[PDB]
Amino acid sequence: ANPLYQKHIISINDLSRDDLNLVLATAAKLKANPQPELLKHKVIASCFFEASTRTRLSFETSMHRLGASVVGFSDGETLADTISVISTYVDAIVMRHPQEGAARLATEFSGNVPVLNAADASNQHPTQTLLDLFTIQETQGRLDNLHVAMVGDLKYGRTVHSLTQALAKFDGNRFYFIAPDALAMPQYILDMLDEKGIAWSLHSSIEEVMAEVDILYMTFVLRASDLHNAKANMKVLHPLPRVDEIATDVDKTPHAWYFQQAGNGIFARQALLALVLNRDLVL
Amino acid sequence: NPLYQKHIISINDLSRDDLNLVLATAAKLKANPQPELLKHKVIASCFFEASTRTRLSFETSMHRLGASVVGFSDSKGETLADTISVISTYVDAIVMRHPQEGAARLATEFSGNVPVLNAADASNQHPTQTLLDLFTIQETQGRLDNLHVAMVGDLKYGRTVHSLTQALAKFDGNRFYFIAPDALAMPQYILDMLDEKGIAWSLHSSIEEVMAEVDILYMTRVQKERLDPSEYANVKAQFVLRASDLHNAKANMKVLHPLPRVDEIATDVDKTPHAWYFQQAGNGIFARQALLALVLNRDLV
Amino acid sequence: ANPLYQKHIISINDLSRDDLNLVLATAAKLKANPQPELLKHKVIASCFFEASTRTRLSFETSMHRLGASVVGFSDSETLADTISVISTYVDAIVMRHPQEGAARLATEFSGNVPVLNAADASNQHPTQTLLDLFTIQETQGRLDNLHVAMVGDLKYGRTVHSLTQALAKFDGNRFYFIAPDALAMPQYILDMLDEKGIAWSLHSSIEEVMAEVDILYMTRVQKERLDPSEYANVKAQFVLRASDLHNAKANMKVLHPLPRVDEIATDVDKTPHAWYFQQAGNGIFARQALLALVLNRDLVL
Numbered sequence: 001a002n003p004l005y006q007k008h009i010i011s012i013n014d015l016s017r018d019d020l021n022l023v024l025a026t027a028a029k030l031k032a033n034p035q036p037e038l039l040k041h042k043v044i045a046s047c048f049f050e051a052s053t054r055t056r057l058s059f060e061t062s063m064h065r066l067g068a069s070v071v072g073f074s075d076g077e078t079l080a081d082t083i084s085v086i087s088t089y090v091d092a093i094v095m096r097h098p099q100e101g102a103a104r105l106a107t108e109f110s111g112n113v114p115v116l117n118a119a120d121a122s123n124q125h126p127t128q129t130l131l132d133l134f135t136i137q138e139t140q141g142r143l144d145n146l147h148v149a150m151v152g153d154l155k156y157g158r159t160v161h162s163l164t165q166a167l168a169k170f171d172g173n174r175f176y177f178i179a180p181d182a183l184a185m186p187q188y189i190l191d192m193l194d195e196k197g198i199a200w201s202l203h204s205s206i207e208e209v210m211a212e213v214d215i216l217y218m219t220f221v222l223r224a225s226d227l228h229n230a231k232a233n234m235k236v237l238h239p240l241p242r243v244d245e246i247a248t249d250v251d252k253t254p255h256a257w258y259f260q261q262a263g264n265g266i267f268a269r270q271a272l273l274a275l276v277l278n279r280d281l282v283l
Numbered sequence: 284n285p286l287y288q289k290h291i292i293s294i295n296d297l298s299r300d301d302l303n304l305v306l307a308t309a310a311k312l313k314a315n316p317q318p319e320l321l322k323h324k325v326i327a328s329c330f331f332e333a334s335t336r337t338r339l340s341f342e343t344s345m346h347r348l349g350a351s352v353v354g355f356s357d358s359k360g361e362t363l364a365d366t367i368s369v370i371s372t373y374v375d376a377i378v379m380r381h382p383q384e385g386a387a388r389l390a391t392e393f394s395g396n397v398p399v400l401n402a403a404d405a406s407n408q409h410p411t412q413t414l415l416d417l418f419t420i421q422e423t424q425g426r427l428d429n430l431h432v433a434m435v436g437d438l439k440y441g442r443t444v445h446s447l448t449q450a451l452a453k454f455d456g457n458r459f460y461f462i463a464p465d466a467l468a469m470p471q472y473i474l475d476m477l478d479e480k481g482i483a484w485s486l487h488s489s490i491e492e493v494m495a496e497v498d499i500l501y502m503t504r505v506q507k508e509r510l511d512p513s514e515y516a517n518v519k520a521q522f523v524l525r526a527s528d529l530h531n532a533k534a535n536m537k538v539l540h541p542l543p544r545v546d547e548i549a550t551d552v553d554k555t556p557h558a559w560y561f562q563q564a565g566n567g568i569f570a571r572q573a574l575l576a577l578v579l580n581r582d583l584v
Numbered sequence: 585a586n587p588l589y590q591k592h593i594i595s596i597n598d599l600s601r602d603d604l605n606l607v608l609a610t611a612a613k614l615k616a617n618p619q620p621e622l623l624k625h626k627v628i629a630s631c632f633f634e635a636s637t638r639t640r641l642s643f644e645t646s647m648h649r650l651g652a653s654v655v656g657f658s659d660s661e662t663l664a665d666t667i668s669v670i671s672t673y674v675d676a677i678v679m680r681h682p683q684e685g686a687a688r689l690a691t692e693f694s695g696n697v698p699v700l701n702a703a704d705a706s707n708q709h710p711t712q713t714l715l716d717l718f719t720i721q722e723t724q725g726r727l728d729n730l731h732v733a734m735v736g737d738l739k740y741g742r743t744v745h746s747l748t749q750a751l752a753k754f755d756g757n758r759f760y761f762i763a764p765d766a767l768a769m770p771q772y773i774l775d776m777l778d779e780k781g782i783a784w785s786l787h788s789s790i791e792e793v794m795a796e797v798d799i800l801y802m803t804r805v806q807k808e809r810l811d812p813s814e815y816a817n818v819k820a821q822f823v824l825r826a827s828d829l830h831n832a833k834a835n836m837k838v839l840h841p842l843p844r845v846d847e848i849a850t851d852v853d854k855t856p857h858a859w860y861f862q863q864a865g866n867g868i869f870a871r872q873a874l875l876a877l878v879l880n881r882d883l884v885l
Contacts, residue, residue, distance in 0.1 A: 369861060
């Protein structure tokens, strides 16, 4: 069947791998052959209770690229009543809310209208994880047997958490965690990896791993000089926004891939909307 | 149609025939959507006063008819007349909600052939709110005649009750039940209008008195700032609807509420078959669609 | 294949006389024969870092009139990164930013995505100059050999600067600068005009030029920009009344970039010379023409 048809996407953990591969294949096919009229008569609510211009513009561009119309707001009465009302207007609800659990709460009152969570919180940012994995698969050719380093604040970086857990669903990956000692990756994730035969290590500098990595996911400030011995296929990724952790001289190098990654956000979210609102895989 | 390029500023600008046409068009668009009726139209959603509820509903109506939307959600030597003079050269219709009463009517004076639709939901003129109320009543009851309709809450300042009672009074055989604190009773001119047309009505102090007789239960809030705290403590639990209160309700009965609600309807009502306020809000889509369709498209489908 | 394709439009001075004539002919062609699906499947970003309901509504209506989709914000991370990201989503960026360099800077990071400036900076309001030029050409039949008076604050009115510079690219225009001495047209513009042997003169009242002018371009005088000792130099001579038009030529048109305050009395509005609202409306076709030329290589209509 189509396993995502009219399913809620509130958390990345609600997706089996089979689901992940399906979303990725649809993302790639829509990237190759766009379906600008697939959702021609659908209306989608873009409800950003908490403002986030980048993510809203990406989501809404995805909607328009699929031919859907958009109503919405950025920034009283209970959230449940707001959702109970809106779900009578629209065909899907894309929502970002400052409170964790708000998206699931909306699913309790949205009826048959799917909710897609665009939050950045701990629970999930499923479309961000999907666009990360999609960028990795596009640039490396696969999601198995990869070398992935994660740099920066790994205790509060929720996208490294989700991305590590999703990558652990594929075989033969090796992880390198480079962070100050005060902000190490949580043990529950390291234990998740330990229980599988997945190899991981800690490092205090990127120079230790620079020659072996296929993906460098940023959150020490990275300069172009540091990339002297990188693999030709190596890509620097970043969920964005960045401040200083990537210096601007990285931008002109071939390894800089954070903006292309953001651009792939369009095809991840197009794939999610298409799969959730379209029965038939006429993609 | 009789409404082509008509302004919709007040429900009173509509004859009984105009009103029947709007309601019939709403029913037709709910049953058989016309998603490209307004394909090449551009509509301005001008919310000088913010209202997420109404804007999302109105803009959804616009998109369900295939129209494009430009607009603003809130807010120099700029003037309302000049602003309308400019905007009416861009777009094919102007949907506007403005904090001053009379502003939409004033705008029709500078819009030329561009129709203006008043998007207010609660002041002295909220035509699309009354239209969606009437549409919900007719859809769930089969008619707008010979009905038992109860109005509950602050009936002195609940203006949607004022509009709804006046609209229902244009039909035959309706009977009204007014449940309010004595300081918040229906305006005298409306009761006099009901007597002047020979419409039967009665006053009551609680929902228990009438629950078994009513086909429509239209709820309103009672704000504490309307009353002495004395009276409010004394009377507050008296105008709150809970599931328990519906034990002897007629099977056909529907609970309506213009929304938003606070406490005046407990959440245990949502789960009963009589809760219909969200469906009412949803019918707002088709009332507003019907207005846009009749105002911007000449020939009927 | 057209010369503006995928070009950034940041300043009016980036366009030759021939370019302007092409843009204006395109605007006229789109006004006469609408192309509602010319930009179908295009997605355009409307980025108003600084609010401007006027210009935003005009620009976005243009986008929708050509069939484009619109994503954006009206506001009130670095700009380069913001553009680097957004230019991966959309096919063009329409931009208004309070800082003078922001639109050029964005062009450095937008890749192949064209940037169109919607600012009101010094030389950074190209679509305002384009709609001015288009309105002048439409009502007078030409952009050559005109008598053009500019009234009001010519020192800080940046759109009179743009317009004077653009008309100076045509032959035989004659200029009338009517302003307080403290707010006179800047010397560098007069020097540019002297260098192209273009004739201009200063005058103290609208009545002096009324009988000769084809265009009366009005702006407001904000007396705050003056010394109190100069308040008396701003009396009635920079405000147009209907009475003032007794000896005006039949073809004369009164223009104004808007908003207006008192410098054009409302009794001018019903006269045939009032043309500021039609001008604002022509903004649609100037902006449509720019978007069409920038986003479509082969423009067949």
